[PDB]
Ligand binder design. Sequence first.
Ligand SMILES: O=S1(=O)NCN(C2CC2)c2ccc(O)cc21
Ligand SMILES: O=S1(=O)NCN(C2CC2)c2ccc(O)cc21
Ligand SMILES: N[C@@H](CCC(=O)O)C(=O)O
Ligand SMILES: N[C@@H](CCC(=O)O)C(=O)O
Ligand SMILES: [Cl-]
Ligand SMILES: [Cl-]
Ligand SMILES: [Cl-]
Lengths: 263, 263
Amino acid sequence: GANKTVVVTTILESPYVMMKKNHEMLEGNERYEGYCVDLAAEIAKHCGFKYKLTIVGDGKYGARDADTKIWNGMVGELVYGKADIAIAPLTITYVREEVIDFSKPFMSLGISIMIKKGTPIESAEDLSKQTEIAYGTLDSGSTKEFFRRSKIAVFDKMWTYMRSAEPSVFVRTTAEGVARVRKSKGKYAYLLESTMNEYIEQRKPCDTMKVGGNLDSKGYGIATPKGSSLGNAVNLAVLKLSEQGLLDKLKNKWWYDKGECGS
Amino acid sequence: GANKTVVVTTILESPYVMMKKNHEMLEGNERYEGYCVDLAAEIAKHCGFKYKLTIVGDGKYGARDADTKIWNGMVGELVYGKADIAIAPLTITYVREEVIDFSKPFMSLGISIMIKKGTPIESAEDLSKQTEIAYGTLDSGSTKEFFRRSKIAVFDKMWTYMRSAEPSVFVRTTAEGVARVRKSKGKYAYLLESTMNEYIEQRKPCDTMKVGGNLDSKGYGIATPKGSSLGNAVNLAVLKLSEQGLLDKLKNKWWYDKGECGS
Ligand SMILES: O=S1(=O)NCN(C2CC2)c2ccc(O)cc21
Ligand SMILES: O=S1(=O)NCN(C2CC2)c2ccc(O)cc21
Ligand SMILES: N[C@@H](CCC(=O)O)C(=O)O
Ligand SMILES: N[C@@H](CCC(=O)O)C(=O)O
Ligand SMILES: [Cl-]
Ligand SMILES: [Cl-]
Ligand SMILES: [Cl-]
Protein backbone atom coordinates (compact mmCIF):
# COMPACT_ATOMS: atom_id res chain seq x y z
CA GLY A 1 0.00 0.00 0.00
CA ALA A 2 0.91 3.67 0.30
CA ASN A 3 3.63 4.79 2.70
CA LYS A 4 2.37 5.04 6.29
CA THR A 5 3.93 6.86 9.22
CA VAL A 6 5.95 4.36 11.28
CA VAL A 7 4.82 4.12 14.91
CA VAL A 8 7.91 3.98 17.16
CA THR A 9 7.45 2.79 20.74
CA THR A 10 10.06 4.01 23.21
CA ILE A 11 10.41 4.81 26.92
CA LEU A 12 11.26 7.90 28.99
CA GLU A 13 14.69 6.89 30.23
CA SER A 14 17.60 9.33 30.42
CA PRO A 15 19.62 9.95 28.35
CA TYR A 16 17.93 7.80 25.69
CA VAL A 17 14.64 9.78 25.66
CA MET A 18 14.03 12.92 27.76
CA MET A 19 11.48 15.72 27.79
CA LYS A 20 12.85 18.83 26.08
CA LYS A 21 12.91 22.22 27.78
CA ASN A 22 9.68 23.90 26.55
CA HIS A 23 7.91 20.59 25.88
CA GLU A 24 4.75 22.11 27.38
CA MET A 25 4.34 24.10 24.18
CA LEU A 26 5.76 21.56 21.72
CA GLU A 27 4.01 18.77 19.81
CA GLY A 28 4.92 15.49 18.13
CA ASN A 29 8.55 14.35 17.94
CA GLU A 30 9.76 17.84 18.92
CA ARG A 31 8.78 17.20 22.54
CA TYR A 32 11.71 14.80 22.97
CA GLU A 33 15.50 14.67 22.87
CA GLY A 34 18.24 12.15 23.61
CA TYR A 35 20.32 9.26 22.30
CA CYS A 36 17.42 7.19 20.96
CA VAL A 37 15.74 10.27 19.50
CA ASP A 38 18.95 10.98 17.54
CA LEU A 39 19.26 7.29 16.62
CA ALA A 40 15.66 7.17 15.36
CA ALA A 41 16.33 10.14 13.09
CA GLU A 42 19.41 8.43 11.64
CA ILE A 43 17.65 5.09 11.07
CA ALA A 44 14.63 6.75 9.45
CA LYS A 45 16.90 8.77 7.18
CA HIS A 46 18.81 5.74 5.98
CA CYS A 47 15.64 3.67 5.60
CA GLY A 48 13.50 6.44 4.13
CA PHE A 49 10.43 6.40 6.36
CA LYS A 50 8.51 9.02 8.34
CA TYR A 51 7.80 8.19 11.99
CA LYS A 52 6.03 9.12 15.20
CA LEU A 53 7.65 8.67 18.61
CA THR A 54 5.20 7.29 21.18
CA ILE A 55 6.05 6.75 24.84
CA VAL A 56 4.95 3.30 25.98
CA GLY A 57 1.78 3.64 28.07
CA ASP A 58 2.73 1.54 31.09
CA GLY A 59 6.35 2.76 31.24
CA LYS A 60 7.76 -0.78 31.15
CA TYR A 61 10.40 -2.55 29.06
CA GLY A 62 8.56 -5.86 28.80
CA ALA A 63 7.84 -9.05 30.70
CA ARG A 64 5.45 -11.96 30.15
CA ASP A 65 2.89 -12.68 32.85
CA ALA A 66 3.37 -16.21 34.23
CA ASP A 67 -0.36 -16.99 34.35
CA THR A 68 -2.08 -15.01 31.58
CA LYS A 69 1.00 -15.24 29.32
CA ILE A 70 0.39 -11.61 28.26
CA TRP A 71 3.36 -9.41 27.33
CA ASN A 72 3.48 -5.89 28.74
CA GLY A 73 5.70 -2.87 28.04
CA MET A 74 7.40 -2.14 24.74
CA VAL A 75 7.61 -5.85 23.94
CA GLY A 76 3.83 -6.02 24.31
CA GLU A 77 3.32 -3.01 22.01
CA LEU A 78 5.19 -4.90 19.27
CA VAL A 79 3.67 -8.32 19.93
CA TYR A 80 0.07 -7.02 19.86
CA GLY A 81 0.53 -4.70 16.87
CA LYS A 82 0.35 -1.34 18.65
CA ALA A 83 3.76 -0.23 17.36
CA ASP A 84 5.85 -0.96 14.25
CA ILE A 85 9.28 -0.68 15.86
CA ALA A 86 10.95 -0.05 19.20
CA ILE A 87 13.94 2.29 19.35
CA ALA A 88 15.01 2.17 22.98
CA PRO A 89 17.47 0.55 25.41
CA LEU A 90 15.71 -2.80 24.91
CA THR A 91 17.94 -5.74 25.87
CA ILE A 92 18.37 -8.67 23.49
CA THR A 93 17.25 -11.84 25.31
CA TYR A 94 16.45 -15.45 24.41
CA VAL A 95 12.78 -15.28 25.50
CA ARG A 96 12.24 -11.99 23.66
CA GLU A 97 14.04 -13.18 20.50
CA GLU A 98 11.46 -15.98 20.41
CA VAL A 99 8.57 -13.51 19.97
CA ILE A 100 10.03 -10.37 18.29
CA ASP A 101 12.89 -9.60 15.84
CA PHE A 102 16.05 -7.76 16.97
CA SER A 103 18.65 -5.90 14.90
CA LYS A 104 22.32 -6.53 15.51
CA PRO A 105 23.16 -4.59 18.69
CA PHE A 106 23.62 -0.81 18.59
CA MET A 107 25.05 -0.60 22.13
CA SER A 108 26.67 -3.10 24.53
CA LEU A 109 26.02 -3.42 28.28
CA GLY A 110 26.36 -5.70 31.25
CA ILE A 111 24.51 -5.94 34.58
CA SER A 112 26.44 -3.84 37.10
CA ILE A 113 26.40 -2.53 40.67
CA MET A 114 25.64 1.08 41.60
CA ILE A 115 26.68 2.23 45.07
CA LYS A 116 26.70 5.45 47.03
CA LYS A 117 30.38 6.58 47.10
CA GLY A 118 32.19 5.05 50.07
CA THR A 119 29.98 1.96 50.37
CA PRO A 120 32.20 -1.00 51.32
CA ILE A 121 31.15 -3.20 48.35
CA GLU A 122 33.42 -4.24 45.48
CA SER A 123 31.57 -7.17 43.86
CA ALA A 124 28.33 -9.16 43.63
CA GLU A 125 30.09 -11.78 45.73
CA ASP A 126 30.55 -9.06 48.42
CA LEU A 127 26.83 -8.24 48.28
CA SER A 128 25.74 -11.85 48.60
CA LYS A 129 27.88 -12.39 51.70
CA GLN A 130 26.38 -9.68 53.92
CA THR A 131 22.96 -8.42 55.05
CA GLU A 132 23.51 -4.82 56.16
CA ILE A 133 23.29 -3.38 52.64
CA ALA A 134 20.04 -4.14 50.83
CA TYR A 135 19.97 -4.49 47.04
CA GLY A 136 17.50 -4.83 44.20
CA THR A 137 16.61 -4.29 40.54
CA LEU A 138 14.11 -2.76 38.12
CA ASP A 139 10.69 -4.44 37.65
CA SER A 140 9.55 -5.91 34.34
CA GLY A 141 12.98 -5.98 32.77
CA SER A 142 15.85 -8.16 31.73
CA THR A 143 17.94 -7.60 34.87
CA LYS A 144 15.27 -9.04 37.16
CA GLU A 145 14.79 -12.04 34.83
CA PHE A 146 18.56 -12.68 34.82
CA PHE A 147 18.61 -13.19 38.58
CA ARG A 148 15.37 -15.16 38.65
CA ARG A 149 16.64 -17.62 36.02
CA SER A 150 20.29 -17.91 37.04
CA LYS A 151 21.74 -21.29 38.01
CA ILE A 152 25.02 -19.62 38.95
CA ALA A 153 25.53 -19.95 42.72
CA VAL A 154 26.24 -16.31 43.70
CA PHE A 155 23.35 -14.99 41.56
CA ASP A 156 20.92 -17.68 42.74
CA LYS A 157 21.75 -16.69 46.32
CA MET A 158 21.19 -13.02 45.51
CA TRP A 159 17.80 -13.80 43.89
CA THR A 160 16.74 -15.91 46.87
CA TYR A 161 17.33 -12.86 49.08
CA MET A 162 15.83 -10.23 46.78
CA ARG A 163 12.63 -12.09 45.94
CA SER A 164 11.59 -12.20 49.62
CA ALA A 165 13.16 -8.99 50.97
CA GLU A 166 10.87 -6.72 53.01
CA PRO A 167 10.18 -3.97 52.30
CA SER A 168 10.48 -4.56 48.53
CA VAL A 169 13.92 -3.98 47.03
CA PHE A 170 12.51 -3.65 43.52
CA VAL A 171 11.76 -0.32 41.84
CA ARG A 172 9.40 0.73 39.06
CA THR A 173 11.80 3.13 37.29
CA THR A 174 15.54 3.59 37.07
CA ALA A 175 15.09 7.03 38.68
CA GLU A 176 13.49 5.42 41.73
CA GLY A 177 16.51 3.09 42.09
CA VAL A 178 18.92 6.03 41.85
CA ALA A 179 17.02 7.99 44.51
CA ARG A 180 17.04 4.98 46.81
CA VAL A 181 20.82 4.65 46.49
CA ARG A 182 21.33 8.37 47.00
CA LYS A 183 19.05 8.56 50.04
CA SER A 184 19.91 5.39 51.96
CA LYS A 185 23.31 6.47 53.33
CA GLY A 186 25.11 3.51 51.78
CA LYS A 187 22.56 0.90 52.90
CA TYR A 188 21.11 0.29 49.42
CA ALA A 189 22.90 -0.84 46.25
CA TYR A 190 21.18 -0.94 42.88
CA LEU A 191 21.66 -3.62 40.20
CA LEU A 192 21.32 -2.03 36.75
CA GLU A 193 22.78 -1.99 33.27
CA SER A 194 26.31 -0.55 32.94
CA THR A 195 25.08 2.00 30.38
CA MET A 196 22.65 3.62 32.80
CA ASN A 197 25.15 3.24 35.67
CA GLU A 198 27.88 5.08 33.71
CA TYR A 199 25.46 7.85 32.76
CA ILE A 200 24.31 8.47 36.35
CA GLU A 201 27.93 8.54 37.45
CA GLN A 202 28.29 11.70 35.31
CA ARG A 203 25.28 13.58 36.79
CA LYS A 204 25.01 15.89 39.79
CA PRO A 205 25.51 15.52 42.60
CA CYS A 206 28.18 12.95 41.56
CA ASP A 207 27.63 10.77 44.63
CA THR A 208 27.30 7.36 42.95
CA MET A 209 29.74 5.04 41.22
CA LYS A 210 29.91 1.75 39.36
CA VAL A 211 31.93 -0.97 41.11
CA GLY A 212 33.31 -4.35 40.07
CA GLY A 213 33.16 -6.01 36.67
CA ASN A 214 29.93 -6.61 34.78
CA LEU A 215 27.95 -9.72 35.75
CA ASP A 216 27.11 -10.54 32.12
CA SER A 217 27.54 -9.33 28.52
CA LYS A 218 24.76 -8.41 26.16
CA GLY A 219 23.39 -5.52 24.12
CA TYR A 220 20.42 -3.43 22.96
CA GLY A 221 18.80 -4.04 19.61
CA ILE A 222 16.20 -2.24 17.55
CA ALA A 223 13.10 -4.45 17.70
CA THR A 224 10.32 -5.17 15.20
CA PRO A 225 7.33 -7.56 15.18
CA LYS A 226 8.35 -11.02 14.04
CA GLY A 227 8.72 -11.13 10.27
CA SER A 228 8.25 -7.37 9.79
CA SER A 229 9.57 -6.12 6.45
CA LEU A 230 11.26 -3.20 8.25
CA GLY A 231 13.71 -5.59 9.90
CA ASN A 232 16.26 -6.09 7.12
CA ALA A 233 16.75 -2.40 6.29
CA VAL A 234 16.92 -1.34 9.94
CA ASN A 235 19.53 -4.04 10.65
CA LEU A 236 21.81 -2.87 7.82
CA ALA A 237 21.30 0.71 8.97
CA VAL A 238 22.61 -0.18 12.46
CA LEU A 239 25.74 -1.88 11.07
CA LYS A 240 26.41 1.05 8.72
CA LEU A 241 26.09 3.62 11.53
CA SER A 242 28.32 1.42 13.66
CA GLU A 243 31.02 1.20 10.93
CA GLN A 244 30.82 4.95 10.30
CA GLY A 245 31.57 5.62 13.98
CA LEU A 246 28.29 7.47 14.47
CA LEU A 247 27.09 5.26 17.34
CA ASP A 248 30.34 5.99 19.22
CA LYS A 249 29.89 9.72 18.65
CA LEU A 250 26.27 9.56 19.85
CA LYS A 251 27.27 7.82 23.07
CA ASN A 252 29.98 10.40 23.72
CA LYS A 253 27.51 13.21 23.05
CA TRP A 254 24.89 12.08 25.57
CA TRP A 255 27.10 10.47 28.27
CA TYR A 256 30.32 12.42 28.49
CA ASP A 257 30.33 15.62 26.38
CA LYS A 258 27.81 17.24 28.70
CA GLY A 259 28.73 15.31 31.85
CA GLU A 260 28.21 17.31 35.05
CA CYS A 261 31.02 15.83 37.16
CA GLY A 262 34.13 17.31 35.56
CA SER A 263 36.36 16.62 32.57
CA GLY B 1 29.83 -36.55 2.34
CA ALA B 2 27.29 -38.30 4.57
CA ASN B 3 23.61 -37.36 4.34
CA LYS B 4 22.23 -35.03 7.05
CA THR B 5 25.77 -34.04 8.00
CA VAL B 6 26.23 -30.27 8.40
CA VAL B 7 29.47 -29.06 6.79
CA VAL B 8 31.19 -26.53 9.07
CA THR B 9 33.83 -24.28 7.58
CA THR B 10 36.34 -22.85 10.05
CA ILE B 11 39.91 -21.60 10.13
CA LEU B 12 43.14 -22.42 11.99
CA GLU B 13 43.52 -19.53 14.41
CA SER B 14 44.58 -19.91 18.05
CA PRO B 15 42.87 -20.43 20.44
CA TYR B 16 39.70 -20.79 18.34
CA VAL B 17 40.79 -23.80 16.29
CA MET B 18 44.14 -25.59 16.74
CA MET B 19 45.63 -28.96 15.75
CA LYS B 20 45.77 -31.31 18.75
CA LYS B 21 49.09 -32.88 19.78
CA ASN B 22 49.57 -36.10 17.77
CA HIS B 23 46.77 -35.04 15.42
CA GLU B 24 48.43 -36.98 12.59
CA MET B 25 47.07 -40.27 14.00
CA LEU B 26 43.62 -38.79 14.73
CA GLU B 27 40.73 -38.44 12.26
CA GLY B 28 37.71 -36.25 11.57
CA ASN B 29 36.56 -33.74 14.17
CA GLU B 30 38.91 -35.22 16.77
CA ARG B 31 41.93 -33.70 15.02
CA TYR B 32 40.97 -30.23 16.31
CA GLU B 33 40.59 -28.41 19.62
CA GLY B 34 39.79 -24.88 20.72
CA TYR B 35 37.09 -22.35 21.58
CA CYS B 36 35.26 -22.72 18.25
CA VAL B 37 35.55 -26.49 18.34
CA ASP B 38 33.86 -26.49 21.74
CA LEU B 39 31.28 -23.95 20.54
CA ALA B 40 30.43 -26.10 17.48
CA ALA B 41 29.79 -29.13 19.71
CA GLU B 42 27.49 -27.07 21.95
CA ILE B 43 25.59 -25.50 19.04
CA ALA B 44 25.17 -28.89 17.32
CA LYS B 45 23.86 -30.40 20.57
CA HIS B 46 21.18 -27.73 21.04
CA CYS B 47 20.14 -27.79 17.39
CA GLY B 48 20.35 -31.57 17.05
CA PHE B 49 22.57 -32.01 14.02
CA LYS B 50 25.65 -34.03 13.17
CA TYR B 51 28.51 -32.06 11.63
CA LYS B 52 31.90 -32.24 9.94
CA LEU B 53 34.59 -29.66 10.71
CA THR B 54 36.55 -28.59 7.63
CA ILE B 55 39.37 -26.06 7.50
CA VAL B 56 38.75 -23.46 4.77
CA GLY B 57 40.72 -24.31 1.63
CA ASP B 58 42.45 -20.96 1.05
CA GLY B 59 43.03 -20.18 4.75
CA LYS B 60 41.22 -16.83 4.49
CA TYR B 61 38.40 -15.19 6.41
CA GLY B 62 36.66 -13.56 3.45
CA ALA B 63 36.84 -10.58 1.10
CA ARG B 64 35.23 -9.63 -2.20
CA ASP B 65 37.58 -9.26 -5.17
CA ALA B 66 37.21 -5.68 -6.46
CA ASP B 67 37.44 -6.84 -10.09
CA THR B 68 35.61 -10.16 -10.28
CA LYS B 69 33.30 -9.52 -7.32
CA ILE B 70 34.07 -13.09 -6.22
CA TRP B 71 34.09 -13.82 -2.47
CA ASN B 72 37.00 -15.84 -1.07
CA GLY B 73 37.64 -17.46 2.31
CA MET B 74 34.94 -18.76 4.65
CA VAL B 75 32.50 -16.18 3.31
CA GLY B 76 33.06 -17.62 -0.18
CA GLU B 77 32.46 -21.16 0.97
CA LEU B 78 29.07 -20.07 2.33
CA VAL B 79 28.17 -17.95 -0.69
CA TYR B 80 29.03 -20.65 -3.26
CA GLY B 81 27.59 -23.60 -1.34
CA LYS B 82 30.74 -25.40 -0.20
CA ALA B 83 29.69 -25.25 3.46
CA ASP B 84 26.48 -25.03 5.45
CA ILE B 85 27.72 -22.88 8.33
CA ALA B 86 30.84 -21.09 9.54
CA ILE B 87 31.78 -21.42 13.21
CA ALA B 88 34.89 -19.31 13.61
CA PRO B 89 36.17 -15.86 14.64
CA LEU B 90 34.29 -14.34 11.72
CA THR B 91 33.52 -10.65 12.18
CA ILE B 92 30.04 -9.20 11.67
CA THR B 93 30.30 -6.42 9.09
CA TYR B 94 27.92 -4.41 6.92
CA VAL B 95 29.29 -5.72 3.62
CA ARG B 96 29.17 -9.33 4.84
CA GLU B 97 25.67 -8.98 6.27
CA GLU B 98 24.49 -8.07 2.76
CA VAL B 99 25.46 -11.49 1.42
CA ILE B 100 25.30 -13.97 4.33
CA ASP B 101 23.27 -14.35 7.55
CA PHE B 102 24.88 -13.85 11.01
CA SER B 103 23.71 -14.99 14.44
CA LYS B 104 23.66 -12.52 17.31
CA PRO B 105 27.33 -12.18 18.43
CA PHE B 106 28.94 -14.88 20.58
CA MET B 107 32.05 -12.80 21.36
CA SER B 108 32.86 -9.09 21.29
CA LEU B 109 36.04 -7.49 20.00
CA GLY B 110 37.55 -4.32 18.66
CA ILE B 111 40.45 -3.48 16.37
CA SER B 112 43.50 -2.96 18.56
CA ILE B 113 47.22 -2.18 18.42
CA MET B 114 49.92 -4.72 19.23
CA ILE B 115 53.43 -3.38 19.90
CA LYS B 116 56.76 -4.78 21.01
CA LYS B 117 57.10 -3.87 24.71
CA GLY B 118 58.78 -0.47 25.05
CA THR B 119 57.61 0.92 21.71
CA PRO B 120 56.77 4.66 22.02
CA ILE B 121 53.17 4.32 20.74
CA GLU B 122 50.06 4.77 22.87
CA SER B 123 47.30 5.28 20.29
CA ALA B 124 46.22 5.10 16.65
CA GLU B 125 46.65 8.85 16.38
CA ASP B 126 50.28 8.36 17.49
CA LEU B 127 50.94 5.84 14.71
CA SER B 128 49.47 8.18 12.09
CA LYS B 129 51.55 11.18 13.18
CA GLN B 130 54.90 9.41 12.71
CA THR B 131 56.73 7.30 10.13
CA GLU B 132 59.63 5.50 11.85
CA ILE B 133 57.37 2.70 13.04
CA ALA B 134 55.65 0.78 10.25
CA TYR B 135 52.26 -0.86 10.79
CA GLY B 136 49.88 -3.20 8.99
CA THR B 137 47.03 -5.70 9.06
CA LEU B 138 45.98 -9.18 7.99
CA ASP B 139 45.03 -9.65 4.30
CA SER B 140 41.50 -10.63 3.25
CA GLY B 141 39.88 -9.83 6.58
CA SER B 142 37.63 -7.28 8.22
CA THR B 143 40.40 -5.15 9.74
CA LYS B 144 41.83 -4.33 6.32
CA GLU B 145 38.41 -3.60 4.85
CA PHE B 146 37.65 -1.33 7.81
CA PHE B 147 40.63 0.93 7.10
CA ARG B 148 40.04 0.84 3.35
CA ARG B 149 36.45 2.02 3.75
CA SER B 150 36.91 4.48 6.62
CA LYS B 151 36.16 8.19 6.25
CA ILE B 152 37.24 8.80 9.84
CA ALA B 153 40.21 11.17 9.61
CA VAL B 154 42.96 9.29 11.49
CA PHE B 155 42.00 5.91 10.02
CA ASP B 156 41.83 7.34 6.50
CA LYS B 157 45.34 8.71 7.04
CA MET B 158 46.58 5.33 8.24
CA TRP B 159 45.06 3.61 5.21
CA THR B 160 46.69 6.09 2.82
CA TYR B 161 50.08 5.11 4.28
CA MET B 162 49.44 1.35 4.56
CA ARG B 163 48.13 0.76 1.03
CA SER B 164 51.29 2.25 -0.54
CA ALA B 165 53.96 1.25 2.01
CA GLU B 166 56.68 -0.98 0.63
CA PRO B 167 57.74 -3.64 1.47
CA SER B 168 54.12 -4.70 2.09
CA VAL B 169 52.96 -4.03 5.64
CA PHE B 170 50.25 -6.68 5.21
CA VAL B 171 50.57 -10.27 6.36
CA ARG B 172 49.02 -13.56 5.36
CA THR B 173 48.34 -14.94 8.85
CA THR B 174 48.11 -13.69 12.41
CA ALA B 175 51.22 -15.66 13.44
CA GLU B 176 53.16 -13.86 10.70
CA GLY B 177 52.05 -10.45 11.97
CA VAL B 178 53.03 -11.35 15.52
CA ALA B 179 56.37 -12.71 14.36
CA ARG B 180 57.03 -9.44 12.54
CA VAL B 181 56.32 -7.39 15.68
CA ARG B 182 58.71 -9.60 17.67
CA LYS B 183 61.57 -9.39 15.14
CA SER B 184 61.43 -5.74 14.06
CA LYS B 185 63.04 -4.37 17.23
CA GLY B 186 59.98 -2.19 17.81
CA LYS B 187 59.80 -0.79 14.27
CA TYR B 188 56.59 -2.67 13.38
CA ALA B 189 53.17 -2.49 15.05
CA TYR B 190 50.37 -4.89 14.17
CA LEU B 191 46.68 -4.02 13.88
CA LEU B 192 44.59 -7.02 14.93
CA GLU B 193 41.46 -7.91 16.87
CA SER B 194 41.59 -7.42 20.65
CA THR B 195 40.73 -11.09 21.36
CA MET B 196 43.76 -12.46 19.53
CA ASN B 197 45.90 -9.57 20.88
CA GLU B 198 44.93 -10.46 24.47
CA TYR B 199 45.62 -14.17 23.89
CA ILE B 200 49.14 -13.52 22.58
CA GLU B 201 49.91 -10.99 25.33
CA GLN B 202 49.73 -13.84 27.86
CA ARG B 203 51.98 -16.34 26.02
CA LYS B 204 55.78 -16.67 25.96
CA PRO B 205 58.08 -14.97 25.08
CA CYS B 206 55.90 -12.29 26.80
CA ASP B 207 57.31 -9.45 24.68
CA THR B 208 54.15 -7.98 23.11
CA MET B 209 51.35 -5.84 24.48
CA LYS B 210 48.06 -4.19 23.58
CA VAL B 211 48.11 -0.39 23.85
CA GLY B 212 45.38 2.23 23.77
CA GLY B 213 41.65 1.71 23.55
CA ASN B 214 40.07 -0.31 20.76
CA LEU B 215 39.56 1.53 17.45
CA ASP B 216 36.02 0.17 16.98
CA SER B 217 33.42 -2.12 18.56
CA LYS B 218 31.97 -5.26 17.04
CA GLY B 219 31.69 -9.01 17.40
CA TYR B 220 31.87 -12.49 15.88
CA GLY B 221 28.75 -14.26 14.70
CA ILE B 222 27.96 -17.75 13.48
CA ALA B 223 27.32 -17.42 9.76
CA THR B 224 24.97 -19.23 7.39
CA PRO B 225 24.04 -18.80 3.71
CA LYS B 226 21.24 -16.28 3.19
CA GLY B 227 17.87 -17.87 3.90
CA SER B 228 19.33 -21.01 5.46
CA SER B 229 16.86 -23.01 7.56
CA LEU B 230 19.66 -23.44 10.14
CA GLY B 231 19.81 -19.74 10.96
CA ASN B 232 16.95 -19.42 13.43
CA ALA B 233 17.94 -22.39 15.63
CA VAL B 234 21.64 -21.46 15.67
CA ASN B 235 20.75 -17.90 16.69
CA LEU B 236 18.61 -19.03 19.61
CA ALA B 237 21.33 -21.50 20.60
CA VAL B 238 23.86 -18.64 20.81
CA LEU B 239 21.60 -16.57 23.06
CA LYS B 240 20.86 -19.58 25.30
CA LEU B 241 24.58 -20.37 25.72
CA SER B 242 25.14 -16.70 26.47
CA GLU B 243 22.44 -16.51 29.14
CA GLN B 244 23.58 -19.78 30.73
CA GLY B 245 27.03 -18.23 31.13
CA LEU B 246 28.66 -20.88 28.94
CA LEU B 247 30.23 -18.42 26.49
CA ASP B 248 32.00 -16.75 29.42
CA LYS B 249 33.16 -20.16 30.71
CA LEU B 250 34.55 -21.06 27.28
CA LYS B 251 36.43 -17.78 27.05
CA ASN B 252 37.91 -18.25 30.53
CA LYS B 253 39.04 -21.74 29.54
CA TRP B 254 40.79 -20.93 26.26
CA TRP B 255 42.22 -17.62 27.49
CA TYR B 256 43.22 -19.28 30.82
CA ASP B 257 46.39 -17.72 32.28
CA LYS B 258 48.93 -20.39 33.28
CA GLY B 259 51.40 -17.65 34.17
CA GLU B 260 53.85 -17.88 31.30
CA CYS B 261 54.29 -14.16 31.89
CA GLY B 262 54.89 -13.06 35.49
CA SER B 263 52.92 -14.36 38.48
O1 LIG C 1 23.13 -10.08 23.38
S1 LIG C 1 24.02 -10.27 22.25
O2 LIG C 1 23.52 -10.11 20.91
N1 LIG C 1 24.66 -11.81 22.36
C1 LIG C 1 25.49 -11.98 23.54
N2 LIG C 1 26.65 -11.09 23.51
C2 LIG C 1 27.88 -11.60 24.13
C3 LIG C 1 29.15 -11.74 23.31
C4 LIG C 1 28.39 -12.96 23.74
C5 LIG C 1 26.54 -9.74 23.15
C6 LIG C 1 27.59 -8.83 23.39
C7 LIG C 1 27.53 -7.47 23.04
C8 LIG C 1 26.36 -6.99 22.46
O3 LIG C 1 26.24 -5.67 22.10
C9 LIG C 1 25.29 -7.85 22.21
C10 LIG C 1 25.39 -9.21 22.55
O1 LIG D 1 28.88 -5.93 15.22
S1 LIG D 1 27.70 -5.86 16.08
O2 LIG D 1 26.65 -6.85 15.97
N1 LIG D 1 27.03 -4.35 15.92
C1 LIG D 1 27.92 -3.30 16.39
N2 LIG D 1 28.21 -3.42 17.82
C2 LIG D 1 28.42 -2.18 18.58
C3 LIG D 1 27.58 -1.85 19.80
C4 LIG D 1 27.41 -1.06 18.54
C5 LIG D 1 28.55 -4.67 18.38
C6 LIG D 1 29.10 -4.76 19.68
C7 LIG D 1 29.44 -5.98 20.28
C8 LIG D 1 29.25 -7.15 19.56
O3 LIG D 1 29.57 -8.35 20.11
C9 LIG D 1 28.71 -7.11 18.28
C10 LIG D 1 28.37 -5.88 17.71
N1 LIG E 1 17.12 -2.69 29.26
C1 LIG E 1 16.35 -3.52 30.18
C2 LIG E 1 15.70 -2.66 31.28
C3 LIG E 1 16.64 -2.24 32.43
C4 LIG E 1 17.00 -3.39 33.39
O1 LIG E 1 16.31 -4.43 33.38
O2 LIG E 1 17.97 -3.24 34.17
C5 LIG E 1 15.28 -4.30 29.43
O3 LIG E 1 15.23 -4.27 28.19
O4 LIG E 1 14.47 -5.00 30.05
N1 LIG F 1 38.05 -11.78 12.30
C1 LIG F 1 38.53 -11.16 11.07
C2 LIG F 1 39.94 -11.67 10.71
C3 LIG F 1 41.07 -11.02 11.51
C4 LIG F 1 41.31 -9.55 11.17
O1 LIG F 1 40.86 -9.11 10.09
O2 LIG F 1 41.96 -8.84 11.98
C5 LIG F 1 37.57 -11.44 9.92
O3 LIG F 1 36.50 -12.05 10.13
O4 LIG F 1 37.83 -11.04 8.78
CL1 LIG G 1 -0.05 7.53 8.01
CL1 LIG H 1 52.16 -32.54 16.89
CL1 LIG I 1 47.62 5.66 -5.58
